[PDB]
Amino acid sequence: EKPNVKWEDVAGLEGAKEALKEAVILPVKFPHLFKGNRKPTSGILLYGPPGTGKSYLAKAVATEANSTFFSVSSSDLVSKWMGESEKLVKQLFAMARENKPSIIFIDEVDALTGTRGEGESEASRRIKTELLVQMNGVGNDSQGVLVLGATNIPWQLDSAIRRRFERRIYIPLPDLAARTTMFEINVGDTPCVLTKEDYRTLGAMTEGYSGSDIAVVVKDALMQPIRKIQSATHFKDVSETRKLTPCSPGDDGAIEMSWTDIEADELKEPDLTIKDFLKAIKSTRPTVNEDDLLKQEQFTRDFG
Amino acid sequence: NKKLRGALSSAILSEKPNVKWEDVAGLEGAKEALKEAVILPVKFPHLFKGNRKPTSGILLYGPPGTGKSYLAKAVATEANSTFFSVSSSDLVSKWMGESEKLVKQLFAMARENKPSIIFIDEVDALTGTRGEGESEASRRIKTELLVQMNGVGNDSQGVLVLGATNIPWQLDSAIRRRFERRIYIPLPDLAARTTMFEINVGDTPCVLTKEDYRTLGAMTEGYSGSDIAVVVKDALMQPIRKIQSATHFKDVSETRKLTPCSPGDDGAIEMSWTDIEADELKEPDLTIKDFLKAIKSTRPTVNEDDLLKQEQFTRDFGQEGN
Amino acid sequence: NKKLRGALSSAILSEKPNVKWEDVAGLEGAKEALKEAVILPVKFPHLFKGNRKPTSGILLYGPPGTGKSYLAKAVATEANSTFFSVSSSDLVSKWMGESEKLVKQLFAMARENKPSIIFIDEVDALTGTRGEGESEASRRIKTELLVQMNGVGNDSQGVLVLGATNIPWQLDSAIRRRFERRIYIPLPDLAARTTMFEINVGDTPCVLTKEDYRTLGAMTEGYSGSDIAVVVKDALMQPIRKIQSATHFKDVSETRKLTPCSPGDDGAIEMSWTDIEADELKEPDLTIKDFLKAIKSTRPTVNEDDLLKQEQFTRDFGQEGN
Amino acid sequence: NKKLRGALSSAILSEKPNVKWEDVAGLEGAKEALKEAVILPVKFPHLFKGNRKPTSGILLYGPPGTGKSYLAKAVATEANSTFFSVSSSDLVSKWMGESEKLVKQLFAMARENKPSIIFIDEVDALTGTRGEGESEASRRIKTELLVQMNGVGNDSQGVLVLGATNIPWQLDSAIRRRFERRIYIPLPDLAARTTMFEINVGDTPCVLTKEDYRTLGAMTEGYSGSDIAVVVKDALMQPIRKIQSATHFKDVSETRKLTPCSPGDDGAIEMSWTDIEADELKEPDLTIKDFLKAIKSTRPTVNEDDLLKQEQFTRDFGQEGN
Amino acid sequence: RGALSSAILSEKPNVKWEDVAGLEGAKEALKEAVILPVKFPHLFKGNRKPTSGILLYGPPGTGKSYLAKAVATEANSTFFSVSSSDLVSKWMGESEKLVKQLFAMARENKPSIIFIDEVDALTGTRGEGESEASRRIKTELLVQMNGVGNDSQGVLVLGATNIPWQLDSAIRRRFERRIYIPLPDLAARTTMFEINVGDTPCVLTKEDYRTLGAMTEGYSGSDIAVVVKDALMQPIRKIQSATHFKDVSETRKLTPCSPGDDGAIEMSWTDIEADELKEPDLTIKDFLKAIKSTRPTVNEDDLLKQEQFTRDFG
Amino acid sequence: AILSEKPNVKWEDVAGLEGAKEALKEAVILPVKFPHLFKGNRKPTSGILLYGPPGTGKSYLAKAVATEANSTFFSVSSSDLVSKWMGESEKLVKQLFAMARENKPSIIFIDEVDALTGTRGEGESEASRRIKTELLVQMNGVGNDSQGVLVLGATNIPWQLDSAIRRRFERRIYIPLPDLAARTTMFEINVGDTPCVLTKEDYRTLGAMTEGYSGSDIAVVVKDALMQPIRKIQSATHFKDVSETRKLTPCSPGDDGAIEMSWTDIEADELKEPDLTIKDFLKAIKSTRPTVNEDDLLKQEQFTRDFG
Ligand SMILES: Nc1ncnc2c1ncn2[C@@H]1O[C@H](COP(=O)(O)OP(=O)(O)O)[C@@H](O)[C@H]1O
Ligand SMILES: Nc1ncnc2c1ncn2[C@@H]1O[C@H](COP(=O)(O)OP(=O)(O)O)[C@@H](O)[C@H]1O
Ligand SMILES: Nc1ncnc2c1ncn2[C@@H]1O[C@H](COP(=O)(O)OP(=O)(O)O)[C@@H](O)[C@H]1O
Ligand SMILES: Nc1ncnc2c1ncn2[C@@H]1O[C@H](COP(=O)(O)OP(=O)(O)O)[C@@H](O)[C@H]1O
Ligand SMILES: Nc1ncnc2c1ncn2[C@@H]1O[C@H](COP(=O)(O)OP(=O)(O)O)[C@@H](O)[C@H]1O
Ligand code: BEF
Ligand code: BEF
Ligand code: BEF
Ligand SMILES: [Mg+2]
Ligand SMILES: [Mg+2]
Ligand SMILES: [Mg+2]
Ligand SMILES: [Mg+2]
C-alpha cells in the first residue's frame, strides 16, 4: 500500500535507513546478487523510546518497498476464544507465503512476548509458541517474508524471540540537523517570515524532543493566529481596499469588534513569528525520563 | 470424519527439507539414538522380533538455538517414513471437546501410514504440570495425549513421537514418563564450532586455512549454532558493503572486469557500483578481518543461569547428547 | 439413541490384549481384589445370593508407571466379560447436552450386555470437584455419571466400573463415595523387581543366573516398572550395538556362523556386519555388564514429594496394594 | 406433542424399589415431614380444606452418603402416587427452547396425573445462582423452573417437588425460596449406626450379640450410611477368604458337611474347596474378628470441613433432621 | 394464532386489593394506570396520556407476582401472562412473528394488560447470546414498545424481576416507573397473620398477632404464609400423637387430652369415628413453635445490591 | 441504528450555555462561514468532545451547531452500538462515516463515547477491539477526506473515556449545569400551554428554587406537577360544587358546600379536577432530587482547566 512516505521524508539515523534499504531494496532491485550462501535478512527488531519514528519508518518501507505490507498489531491478535489467537497468526503467514515478497510489521511486539515467567498458560505459551514455530520451524519456509517489530520495553522480551530477531537496531533520541529538518517539513507551504537561522534557532532550542512533540509544537504554532482572530476584541486597518487585523485594546485605529463583524477576505490574519514557536515549545512538554534511557542502553550493550 | 481429515491434510509435509546428517555438527549421541530408533527398524525389520522392540518416544531438550528443530529436519530428510510436523495451531479448537478428536484423529491417521514419526515441536506448551491450568485445555488435552500414547486399546506400534523443548522442568511427570529417552542437546564445543564455520562458508571463495577456522572456533566460546550462522551471514555480507562503499574501482584480469579498490591505486577510476555494467563486476575476497568484524558487531543470546537449570534436569532425569 | 450408540460402539474393545495374571509382578492385593470382584461372581454365581453382593467399583491410584493400566489389560484378558474402555474423548461432544446422553447410553449398553466392565481411564479429568468448573461439562457430565452409577431407578447389577488416576486428591467426594474400594498401586519392591527382570528378558539366550537377577533387583531401588522395561530394552539393544562396533568377526560351531571378536583372535577376519550373509550371524549373549551399563545410563521418573501426597491420600481414604 | 411424550414416556417409573420406612435407619424428623406431606393428604383428603393446604416443595441436603436418595426410594414405595424421576439428561435438548418446552410439558403431565411426585435428583446442577452462567441454559431453564413452580397461571395443586443436593450453598435464592422446607440429613449417631449394622447383616448366620453391634457402632464415629453398607459388604466376604485359604477341611453335624480347619485336627482331611461337592460345604459363621478385620481395612469417606459448610447452611436457612 | 393464545388466562385467581398487606404506593400507581383510564376515559385527552410501562422489582418473595394476580382479578381487562417459553422457536423468523402477533392480538382485545414475567430471561445484553433468540426478539420488542401515542388503550406492560441490575439500559428506559417492593414492616406483618389464619378457630387476640408481628422482623410474605401453614398443621400433630381422648359438649365429640383426666379414655385417632373428632384449638405456642423451626430466606447482601439499584435508577 | 436529520435548532433554542456556544461558534462556525481562512496547513478542528454531567441536552446543543453550520446531523449511541447491535457495529461505524462523507457539510454525533472506548486491556475481542479500532481508523479520515465532516463526541463520565479515543478529540468543551434564567425558561417550556395560574414571578420562583437541577430533572418535576389536579380529582372524600350542570372538586373537611364522599360516588364527567398552581410544583420539587453530583462541577472544571 503506497501513499507518499519516502526515504527522503525521514530525519536522522542513516544506520537504520541503510540496514533497511539493504534488507528490502538490495534483494528487490537485485535478486541476482543473493545466490549460494548469501541470503537476505529475515527479521529486524527496531526499538527505542516512544515518539522516535519507528512505525513511520516501517511505512516508509511499505511505500518504498514494492512489497506487500500487513500492518497488524498486538491489538488485533488478542482474542478470548481458545486458540483463536493462533489461527490469525497462521493465516497471516499463509497470505504472506502466497504473496512473495512480503513484509509483516508486528507493532509493539512486547505485548505478545512477555518473558514467560509470570504469564498465563494459554496466551503465553500458545501465542509465543506459535510465533516461534511459525517464524522458522520445520515445515514452514520463511522465504521472502521479513518480520519487523517495534517495542519500547526490549528487556521484557523472551530470549527465544530475542534470538529470532537477528538484527536488534536501536533508535535513539535525535540530534540537531534532524530537528531542524522536521520543523522545515512540518511548516509545509504555510506563509512564514522565518529564515534558516530561525529554524536553526528552534532546533537548537528543543533538545530532548521526539518527532511527535515537534509535530505538535508545529500544530499549536499553526493554530496561534486563528486563535487571535476569533477570540478577538478590537481590530485595525492597515496598508487593495480595506484590510483589518487583531490589535490590543486602544491602538492606532483600533475599532472594537469581532471576526464575525468583518467582511469576507478583508481580514489581515496574524503572521507566523518565531515567538509563536517559542510559545508552543514552552507550553508543550515531552514524555521521557532519564532512567528509562539507562535500561535501553543496558539492553543495547548486552544484545543490540 | 472427513472434516477432521480436511483439517489434518495440511500436516503431511511434502517437500523434504534437504538437510543431511553430515550438516548437523557435533552431537553423535543424539544422532546415534535417532538412527537406531528411526533408520534401523525399517532397514532391517527381521531383527526386531520377540522381546526386542523399537523405541517409541524421544525428547530432545536444551538451551535455545542449539540444534533441536534442525536435527528434526535431518530426520525428516533421511528417515524414509511419513512425517507429521504437528503444532499447537493444529490441535486446539473452539467447540468444547473438538480438540481431543484431533489428537485421537492424528494418531488414528498415523497408524494408517505406518511407519510414522510425529514431531511435536515445543511440547511444553501443551503439557504444563497441571497444578494451575484450566479444566478443559489442561485435563483434556493432556489426558488424551497420555491415554493415546500408551493406554489400553491403543497399540503404539510403529509410531514414534519426537518432541523438543526449552523448559524441560515444566513438564508433567506422566509425560516425562512417556518420553523414554530424554536426550540433552548442549552448547557446542571447539570441534563443533570449527565444523560449523567450515559448513556455513559453503563453497564461497575464501583465503582461509584450517588454522584460521581453528582460530575462530577458539575465539567464539559461548556461542550457539544460530550465532555462528549469523556471524557467517554478516561476514559474507561485508564484500557487498565494499562495493556500495566504493569511491573507486579498478580493472583486473573475458572483456572488462572491475572490483573495489582504495582511493588512488593501479588503475583506480572513481565511480559507484551503479556506474558499472551488468556482470562486469568483480567482487571482493574473504579474509579473517571480515569474520573478526562480524564477531565484534554480533552479540550473543544465552545467559549462564539457564544452563544451571538445564544441567539440573540432566543430572536428575536425563541422557547426554554428546 | 442409535446415533449415540453408533458413536460409542467403538469403545467396547475386542482385541483382548494378551496379558495374563502371571505377567504382573508384585501387587498380590490388587490382583486379589480384582479376582474376587470379576472372576469369582461369574465362575460360582450360586454363592453370591442373599446379602453377599459383588463389588461395584474399584479405583486404582498410584504414581506414574506402576501397573494400573497394565492390570486393567490383565482383567481384559482374563475376565470373560464385555470389557468396555471409555475415556474423556468419547463422552464430551459439541451440541449442547449430547455429552450426557452419551454417558447415559454408555451405561445402558453395559446393562444390555451384562456382566460388563467399564474402564474409565484417568477419571480425574471427567470429575473435578465442581466448585470452579463450567456449567455444561462440569455439572452435567459429572452429574449424569453420579446418578447413573447408583441413582434411584438405575440398578447397577452386574456392571463393574473401574478407573485409574494419578491425582486422587482432586476427585469429587461423591465420586470418591461411588468407588467403594480405593486400592493403592505403589512403586515396586525387591521380589517384584527380580520378577520383572525375569519376565522382560523373555526367552532371550542369556548366561544369567538367579543370583544375577537377584543382583540387579538389589541394584535398582527406586525404579518403577516402566524403567525396568526400558533397561531391559536397552540391554537387549547392546549386542546389536557391539555388532556395529566390530571391526572383526570370527567363525564358530549348520553351515557358517560368525560373531564379533576383538582385533586379532582365533579365526578373526576383518569385516563389518554389512559384509556378512543373511542369518549366518551369531549374536553375542548378555553380560551383567550390559545391564549395569543400562542402569547407569537410565534414570528414574519419580521424585519424593509426590510420594508424600500419595501416602497422605492412602492414610486418609485408602487401601494398601501390597 | 407425541414426539415429546414419546421422549418422556421413559420417566414414569414402574418398578417400586422395595425400601420401606424401617429400612431407613435414623431420621425421625425427615420421615415425619415426608409422611405428612405425601402419605397423609391421600389417606385423609377431607382434612385439607380451607386454609390447611399440603406442602409443595421439600429440599433434602447433607453430606454424601447419608440417606437422601434412599429416603426418596422409601417415598417411591410407600406413596401410592405417580413418581416421576427426572434429571438434567432429560431436560436439556438440542433445539432452541426445548429445555423450556420440556419442563412445561413435565409439569403438565404431572398435573394430568395428580397426585404426583417429581424427584429432581441433584438440583444443584440445574440451578446455579445465575451470576456467572450462560444465557440459554442458565436464564431459560432456571427461569422456566421458577415460573412453572409457582407463577401466575400455573396451579401447583397436588404436585410435590422433592430434590436432593450436596452443595446447598450454591443454590439460587429464588429456588431456595421455592423449596419451602429445607431439611438436613446428617451423619448418623450411635443408635442409628447400631441399627444400620443390624439391618445390613440381614438374616446371615452370625454369632454376634447386641453388645457386639453396640461395640461396632461405638467404633465407627464419622461414617455415613454408605460406609457402613460397605463394611458389611466386605465383612460378608470374609467366610469365602477362609474357605479358599483352607489346606484341610473336616466333617461336622443331612448327609456330609465339611468346613475349613487347621492342619491336623479331629477328622482333618487335606483338600481344597475345589475338591468338595456342591452344597456340602460348611462356611464359618460371621464371627466378630471378621467385622474387626473389615473396620480396620475400611476408612471414612467424608472429611471434616465439608461438615462446617453444611452446618453453616443449616444455621442460616435450615431445619434439623434429627 | 393458536399457539400464543395459550397466554390468555381465564380462571381469575381471586385475590382482591385488600389481601396484599401494605404496599400503598404500588396500589396507588397501579390504580391510576389500570382502573382510572377505563372508569373515566374522558380525562385522558390532549397532553394527558396514560402510563405505558411499569417495572416492579425487589428481593425474592415480597409480593410482585401476587400483586400481578390482584391486577388480574380486579382489572376487567384481557390479560396475557406470556413468558420466554412461549416466544422463542427453532425456525428462524418465528421469534419475530410471535412477538408481533402478541401485540396485534393485544390490540384485538383492548384494553390489554400484558405481564411479561421475569424480563431478564428474554433480554440479556446481547454481547454473548446466540443469533436467533437474543437479537431479533429484543430488537422487535424494543420497536413494539416504542408505540407511545398509538397505545392509548390496550398495552400496559408490567414486569417483575429479582435481578434488576442485570437488565439492559434500553429496557430500563422503556419501563418508565421502576417501583421497589420491599420486605414488610410491622403493621403489614400483623395484617398478614390476621389474613392467613382465615376463619380458623383460634384463641388469639389482637395483642397476640401484634406480638408475632413484633417477633418476625426480616421475614417476607412467603415466610409468614408458611409459618401459618406449619402452625395450622400443629393440631394434627396433637391428634396423631395421642394416647387418650375425651368427650366434650350434636352427638359425641372427642379431643386429645393428657393421660388421666375428666373422662379420659385411652385410644388413638384411628379408633375414633368419622367427624366425631374435636380438632384442638390454635394456641400461641403453635406459632412460637413454628417461628422457632422456620428460618428466614433473604440474605442481607442481596439487599445491598437492591438498594444500590434503587439509589441509582429507581 | 443511525439517525440522520437536518435539524432546526437555533442557538436561542438552547437554554444558556453561552460559553460553549461561543466556543463552538469559533471552533465550527467560523471555519464554515469563511472557508478561505483555511488554505494550506491551517485546518479546522474535526473532533470535539462535549463533556459534563447528564441532563444538559449535549445532544440538543449538538443539533444547534449543525443547524447553524447548515449541515446534516448524523448520530449514533455508543451504548446501543456496544450492546444492541454488537455483531454489526463495525459495519455501522463504517456506514456512519460513509454517509457523512457523501453528505458534506455534515456532523457526526457519537453519544456516550465512554460506553464504547474502555482502554482495551480487559475487553472482549469483537466489541472491544473491533468497535474501538474502527472509530479510530475513521477519525483518521480527516486526512483521506479531512474537509467537510466533523465528529462531536458526548460523554457524562469523561474520566472513563479511553485515552486513545480521548486523544482524537482535539477540542474539548465543558457543558455545565444550567442557571436561574434557563431553569425559568425550562419550566415555561415544560408546561407550555397547560392550563395553570402561574405568574411570571412564580416561574422565576420555580427557577430560583431549583439550583443544581438539570433540564431532565426539571422535565420530570414538571411532568409530576401537571398531574396534580388529576391526582386530586381522582382521590378525595369531601368534595364541593363550583361554577353546565353540577361540577364537584376535592376540598378540605368542613368548607363552603363540603359534602362527604369519594370519587367513586361522583358521576361521570361532573368531577372537577383541581386547577394548576405554582405552589403545587414546589411539591414536585421536594419529591425529585437533582440527578447530578456536586463534585462534577470540579471534575468538569478540571477538564476545562486541562483540555478546555
Ligand atoms: N525521527 C522522526 N523523523 C521524522 N518524523 C518523525 C520522527 N519521529 C516521529 N515522526 C513523525 O511523528 C509521527 C508519529 O511517529 P510514530 O512512528 O508513530 O511514533 P512511534 O515511533 O513512537 O510509534 C510519524 O508519522 C512521524 O512522521
Ligand atoms: N549443531 C548445529 N549444526 C548445524 N547447524 C546448527 C546447529 N545448531 C544450530 N544450527 C543452526 O540453527 C538453526 C536451527 O535452529 P535450532 O538450532 O533448531 O533452534 P532450536 O534448536 O532452539 O529449535 C539453523 O540455522 C542451523 O543452521
Ligand atoms: N507390575 C508390573 N508387572 C509387570 N510389568 C509392569 C508392571 N507395572 C508396570 N509394568 C510395565 O510398565 C509398562 C507401562 O506401565 P503401564 O501399563 O503404562 O502402567 P500405567 O498405565 O499405570 O502407567 C507396562 O507395559 C509394563 O511393561
Ligand atoms: N440412613 C440410612 N439407613 C439405611 N441405609 C442407609 C442409610 N444411608 C445410607 N444407607 C445405605 O447407603 C446407601 C447410600 O444411600 P444413598 O441413597 O445412595 O445415599 P445418598 O443418595 O445420600 O448418597 C444406600 O443404598 C443404603 O444402601
Ligand atoms: N402482600 C402480600 N399479601 C399477602 N400475601 C403475600 C404478600 N406478599 C407475599 N405474600 C405471600 O407470599 C406468597 C408468595 O408471593 P409471590 O407472588 O410468590 O411473591 P413474589 O412473586 O414476589 O416472589 C404470596 O402468594 C402469599 O402467599
Ligand atoms: F501409571 Be500409568 F502412567 F497409568
Ligand atoms: F445422594 Be448421596 F448423599 F451421594
Ligand atoms: F419476588 Be418473587 F420471588 F417473584
Ligand atoms: Mg526450533
Ligand atoms: Mg496408564
Ligand atoms: Mg444420591
Ligand atoms: Mg414471583
Side-chain angles (χ1 to χ4, degrees), chain A residues 133 136-137 163-164, chain B residues 68-70 119 121-122 164:
Chain A
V133 174
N136 70 348
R163 190 190 79 83
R164 299 293 192 279
Chain B
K68 302 185 285 291
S69 305
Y70 197 66
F119 174 66
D121 200 355
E122 291 188 357

Side-chain angles (χ1 to χ4, degrees), chain B residues 103 107 111 127 130 138-152 154 156 172-179, chain C residues 64 69 87 121-122 124-125 165-167:
Chain B
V103 173
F107 293 4
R111 295 182 187 93
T127 59
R130 56 184 182 176
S138 176
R139 294 297 195 280
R140 291 180 192 171
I141 306 167
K142 296 169 197 181
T143 295
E144 185 60 31
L145 201 62
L146 293 179
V147 174
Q148 205 58 249
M149 283 178 76
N150 70 348
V152 174
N154 280 320
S156 65
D172 184 77
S173 63
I175 310 166
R176 182 191 298 163
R177 190 190 79 83
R178 299 293 192 279
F179 283 141
Chain C
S69 305
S87 179
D121 200 355
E122 291 188 357
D124 53 356
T165 180
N166 298 326
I167 320 164

Side-chain angles (χ1 to χ4, degrees), chain D residues 150 177, chain E residues 19-21 23 59-66 69 192 221-222 225:
Chain D
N150 70 348
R177 190 190 79 83
Chain E
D19 285 327
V20 286
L23 300 179
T62 63
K64 302 186 285 291
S65 305
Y66 197 66
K69 297 174 189 175
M192 279 189 284
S222 294

Side-chain angles (χ1 to χ4, degrees), chain C residues 150-151 177-178, chain D residues 23-27 63-71 73 196 199-200 225-226 229:
Chain C
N150 70 348
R177 190 190 79 83
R178 299 293 192 279
Chain D
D23 292 333
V24 183
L27 305 173
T66 63
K68 302 185 285 291
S69 305
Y70 197 66
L71 192 56
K73 297 174 189 175
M196 279 189 284
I199 290 169
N200 285 115
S226 294

Side-chain angles (χ1 to χ4, degrees), chain A residues 34 36-39, chain B residues 200-202 204-205 229-241 286 290-291 294:
Chain A
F34 288 143
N37 298 114
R38 188 181 296 163
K39 282 183 182 176
Chain B
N200 285 115
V201 303
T204 299
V230 307
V231 307
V232 176
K233 186 182 289 295
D234 197 353
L236 286 168
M237 294 301 288
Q238 288 298 114
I240 300 302
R241 295 176 183 272
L286 192 65
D290 302 337
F291 288 92

Side-chain angles (χ1 to χ4, degrees), chain E residues 28 32 35-36 39-40 42-44 47-49 125-128 135 138-139 142 168-170 174 176-177, chain F residues 79-80 82-86 88 124 194 223 226-227 230-231 233-235 263-264 266-269 271 273:
Chain E
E28 176 67 31
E32 69 176 359
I35 310 296
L36 188 61
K39 189 180 176 182
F40 297 105
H42 64 85
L43 289 173
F44 288 143
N47 298 114
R48 188 181 296 163
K49 282 183 182 176
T125 205
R126 56 184 182 176
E128 295 180 354
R135 267 75 177 172
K138 197 172 77 176
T139 294
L142 285 179
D168 184 77
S169 63
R174 299 293 192 279
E176 75 191 14
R177 296 193 69 179
Chain F
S79 101
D80 294 4
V82 176
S83 61
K84 293 179 179 179
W85 309 98
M86 183 66 75
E88 27 218 327
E124 60 178 347
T194 316
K223 181 175 165 61
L226 298 176
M227 277 311 280
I230 273 78
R231 292 179 181 176
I233 303 180
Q234 300 180 0
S235 85
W263 63 268
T264 51
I266 296 170
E267 296 289 350
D269 57 54
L271 166 74
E273 63 185 342

